[PDB]
A paper describes a structure:
Here, X-ray crystallography, site-directed mutagenesis and enzymatic activity data are used to define the three-dimensional structure, acceptor/donor substrate binding, membrane binding and catalytic mechanism of [name] from [name]. [name] catalyses an essential step in the biosynthesis of PIMs in M. tuberculosis. The enzyme transfers a palmitoyl moiety from palmitoyl–CoA to the 6-position of the Manp ring linked to 2-position of myo-inositol in PIM1 or PIM2. Our results reveal that the enzyme has an α/β architecture and shares with other important eukaryotic/prokaryotic acyltransferases an acid/base catalytic mechanism involving conserved histidine and aspartic/glutamic acid residues.
Author numbering: 48 to 294
Amino acid sequence: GGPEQLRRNLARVVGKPPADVPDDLIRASLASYARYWREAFRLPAMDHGRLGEQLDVIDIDHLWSALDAGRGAVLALPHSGNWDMAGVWLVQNYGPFTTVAERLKPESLYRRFVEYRESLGFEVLPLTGGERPPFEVLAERLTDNRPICLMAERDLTRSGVQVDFFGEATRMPAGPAKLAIETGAALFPVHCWFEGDGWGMRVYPELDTSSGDVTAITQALADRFAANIATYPADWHMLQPQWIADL
Ligand SMILES: CCCCCCCCCCCCCCCC(=O)O
Ligand SMILES: [Mg+2]
């Protein structure tokens, strides 16, 4: 989609026609987008121990307490800030975790990305073409009282859950809700953003699963993502189509 699709996505976040999205916001979002890729370049070579010691996560005790209760946890977050840096922080402060990635094309580029995240200490499952269904591995991780992390605000396929997002229809993956219902794992929304020259991260209160309804739960997740993106609009680098009307 590139910058023009980014402008159109920011138009929803901010409630204005694409043409009226503030110039300063478009600028900051492109700078934020550039920063992610500049950090991805060097992140495998940074001092991960130092980063784990010196960065903080607001309300990380949410997660720790879910793991003290033996429940496992689903950390669901949007494409904001540098989520790979948060992953480094979790690897250093808790240990390796499991996640999931679209099997991009070409396979050589997919492998580049796998190597990148594996060098950060993550276990990355292919969304397609792996030995086992990713869901089933994830559920086994949760039942072993482990955290999993899922990028959770975009899934524009037939099986994605339709939710309202900044007042308009989009689709988000059902996995986070499905996994929490099936395993009892706590479903924590997470947000990452850029905090000056550093990184801001927060774990939010777990989502109520009493409804047993994937669509209601995913809507609550979307609502929290929308509130967090609204706080740091420039850090949500969604340059791909997000809302259904843009497909
Ligand atoms: C604040 C608590 C720790 C949060 C850690 C979250 C780590 C997220 C890691 C995601 C890795 C996969 C991202 C690539 C997927 C894609 O966009 O195709
Ligand atoms: Mg309840």
